[PDB]
């Protein structure tokens, strides 16, 4: 069985620049003067979709600005210019002998200018009162970079005990994440306490992003 | 074209039977590859049907995999048994070229492997704090709690407000999932006019319609 390794396992490029990346084969992948490698793109939610095939040949439709090129045991997927729609994961393939093979995959992150999240905080919807639960909601959208740090705070004193964070993929459109941070508490709890707070942390910013309110009528 | 239909939810102590129903082209002249992804990892090479009917295997599921079809059905099928949760994943069927590459693909049908049970969410609809409105922009969410197993999925006016949409990936806690989604929009448009959540549960067959209102 012949296996396939990428390298690196993710790489971030700015928009308009270089992004090549790279797939070294075990033992040879060529045949009669073939290379039987090919390469995938997958973006969020989407099945895998063909790039390159037989290690140099431009699938029909994909853009110019991709290509690949190698022999034997090494191989590299290549594009320039990069463009915000290219934030996806890369696989190379091959299929010299059964079984054919993945690589484990290349994450290609799109290098944009910083940007501040937006926040918003959520109280528990009455429905979900009147079922008995407590859930508190944190948006922060639309930033850059991933790295983020959420803190919560119940009548001032932090509260890390039961709260799930959650990251989307990178907009293919703006390049940003955005993160939601949830608080569940039981109701008989959650009414036992006055003021809820989500404290977005992030790079853009001196000042800590605050959103806050109080339990009232 | 290609559509993969499957049971969503499936014991550790049974077995996995997919079918991969094509379109557009026939089995007779085209092979059907099977690709898997367990969730957050890469894709892997399940086999293949050839168009002549023989088959080829990953190797080390090939003793607990079979692969069939029916030309005159349209219709490719994927057995596994002797499961084990970490078969959990999306199982892809794809078109061969024969034998280079994999040109067309099913959107994926999501395979848990669990012993425990089939849940419905709720659905919450979050309105923004209680009052007026401060902003230019106005941002609202859908809380989607207490299901299994995955998928849901979600839109808002019946995926025609796209625009200004985040959907999150859902979070496992005890069993069972929790997942969340904001849109913002601007103040004119809410509380004006309606903005409604929609969320469907293939494994429950359940759909929730969710209205925000303000608080
Ligand atoms: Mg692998």
Redesign the pocket.
């Known amino acids: 069985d012949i296996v396939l390794t990428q390298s690196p396992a993710s790489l971030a490029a700015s928009l308009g620049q270089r992004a090549t990346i790279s797939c070294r084969a075990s033992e040879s992948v060529d045949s009669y003067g073939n290379s039987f490698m090919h390469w995938y793109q997958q973006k969020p939610g989407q099945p895998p979709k063909l790039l390159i095939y037989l290690a140099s040949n431009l699938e029909s439709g994909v853009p110019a600005r991709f290509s690949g090129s190698g022999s034997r045991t090494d191989f590299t997927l290549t594009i320039d210019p990069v463009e915000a729609d290219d934030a996806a994961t890369y696989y190379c393939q091959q299929n010299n002998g059964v079984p054919w093979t993945?690589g484990?995959g290349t994450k290609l992150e799109i290098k944009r200018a910083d940007a501040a999240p937006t926040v918003s905080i959520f109280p528990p919807s009455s429905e979900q009162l009147t079922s008995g639960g407590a859930s508190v909601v944190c948006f922060l959208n639309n930033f850059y970079p991933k790295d983020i740090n959420v803190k919560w705070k119940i009548d001032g004193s932090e509260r890390q005990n039961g709260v799930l964070n959650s990251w989307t993929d990178q907009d293919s459109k703006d390049s940003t994440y955005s993160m939601s941070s949830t608080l569940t508490l039981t109701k008989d709890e959650y009414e036992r306490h006055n003021s809820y707070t989500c404290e977005a942390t992030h790079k853009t910013s001196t000042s800590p992003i605050v959103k806050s309110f109080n339990r009232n009528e | 074209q290609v559509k993969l239909e499957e049971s969503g939810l499936v014991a550790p102590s049974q077995s996995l039977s997919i079918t991969c129903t094509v379109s557009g082209f026939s089995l007779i002249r085209y092979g059907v590859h099977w690709v898997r992804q367990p969730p957050g990892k890469?894709?892997?090479w399940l086999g293949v049907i050839w168009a002549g009917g023989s088959t080829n295997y990953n190797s080390a599921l090939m003793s607990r995999l079979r692969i069939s079809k029916d030309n005159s059905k349209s219709q490719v099928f994927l057995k596994m048994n002797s499961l084990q949760t970490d078969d959990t994943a999306m199982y892809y069927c794809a078109r061969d070229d024969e034998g280079y590459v994999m040109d067309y693909w099913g959107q994926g049908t999501s395979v848990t492997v669990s012993s425990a049970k089939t849940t419905a969410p709720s659905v919450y609809p979050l309105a923004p704090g209680s009052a007026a409105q401060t902003n230019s922009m106005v941002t609202l969410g859908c809380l989607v709690k207490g299901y299994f197993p995955e998928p849901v999925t979600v839109t808002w006016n019946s995926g025609s407000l796209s625009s200004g949409v985040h959907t999150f990936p859902a979070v496992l806690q005890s069993d069972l999932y929790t997942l969340s989604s904001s849109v913002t929009v601007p103040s004119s448009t809410w509380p004006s006019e309606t903005v409604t959540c929609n969320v469907a549960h293939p494994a429950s067959s359940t759909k929730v319609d969710k209205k925000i209102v303000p608080r």
């Open positions: 993945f484990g | 890469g894709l892997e």
